[PDB]
């Protein structure tokens, strides 16, 4: 996360962290329920073996609320294409259930029509993670969050050197130095409505980080709700 602020105590409870065999986070995720994590399909290419950590905010010490969970099954969208990042969505089922507590709670999945008309037409959304703080920077040891405005679909298609499919959407700033970055992928993009937060995207990609004239690209979760629902029953 470039710019933005530190997630304060209990502010980003749905954040999950994919960790490799060496215990270093390499991607993010969103807690959907006691047994399921939502992440990016392109992340399942960042490690031969990995686990999920929840309740973490400062990887440099142990607050005590952290919990590591092993993955029982990985459900990747069959249509995922690495060349363009289309269908960048995956669901993970944990071997053991997550015990909700301070800094550990799930984000709400919305209904398609209501979300696209009322949630996604809001001014901003919130993105978070342990990713880089600068394009050439190092990973953050603190969990960060940032308010990212929704970006006009046309203006975004125009600004990108790559294809923006119907399974993606854009958010961020044209010139302002705030945006997600490497390591935040798979992480949560949520929108707040009357003090309740709903999942609206999955950190997917961008051309660099916070570059002028470039935006952050997220997987359009509203386009995969039926898919997510089916995966959470298999």
């Amino acid at each position: 996360i470039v710019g933005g602020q530190e997630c304060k105590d209990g502010e980003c409870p749905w954040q999950a962290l994919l960790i490799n065999e060496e215990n270093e986070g390499f991607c993010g995720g969103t807690i959907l329920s006691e047994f399921y994590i939502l992440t990016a399909a392109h992340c399942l290419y960042q490690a031969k073996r990995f686990k999920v950590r929840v309740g973490d905010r400062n990887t440099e010490q142990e607050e005590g609320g952290e919990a590591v969970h092993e993955v029982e099954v990985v459900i990747k969208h069959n249509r995922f294409t690495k060349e363009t990042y289309d269908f960048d969505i995956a669901v993970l089922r944990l071997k053991t259930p997550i015990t909700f507590r301070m800094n550990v709670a799930p984000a709400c999945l919305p209904e398609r029509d209501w979300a696209e008309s009322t949630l996604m037409t809001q001014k901003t959304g919130i993105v978070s993670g342990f990713g880089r703080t600068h394009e050439k920077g190092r990973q953050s040891t603190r969990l960060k969050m940032l308010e990212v405005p929704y970006v006009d679909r046309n203006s975004c298609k125009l600004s990108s050197s790559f294809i923006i499919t119907q399974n993606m959407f854009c958010a961020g700033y044209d010139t302002k130095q705030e945006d997600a970055c490497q390591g935040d992928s798979g992480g949560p993009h949520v929108t707040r409505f009357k003090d309740t937060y709903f999942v609206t995207g999955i950190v997917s990609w961008g051309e660099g980080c916070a570059r002028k004239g470039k935006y952050g690209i997220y997987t359009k979760v509203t386009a995969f709700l039926k898919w997510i629902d089916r995966s959470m029953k298999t």
Binding site: R101, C108, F193
Partner: protein
């Protein structure tokens, strides 16, 4: 500005327009209040809420 387009139809969460009428609903883990608008958490740590303790 009519129905679900007029302040989310006074619903806490999901709003659906049926027969020119507003019908409210909630996310899993919540139950619609007696006023058919508000959403009541079913148990501890309901989705979408920041943790206070």
């Amino acid at each position: 500005r009519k129905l679900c387009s007029l302040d989310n139809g006074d619903c806490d969460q999901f709003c659906h327009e049926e027969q020119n009428s507003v019908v409210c609903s909630c996310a899993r883990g919540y139950t619609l209040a007696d006023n058919g608008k508000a959403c009541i958490p079913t148990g501890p740590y309901p989705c979408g809420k920041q943790t206070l303790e």
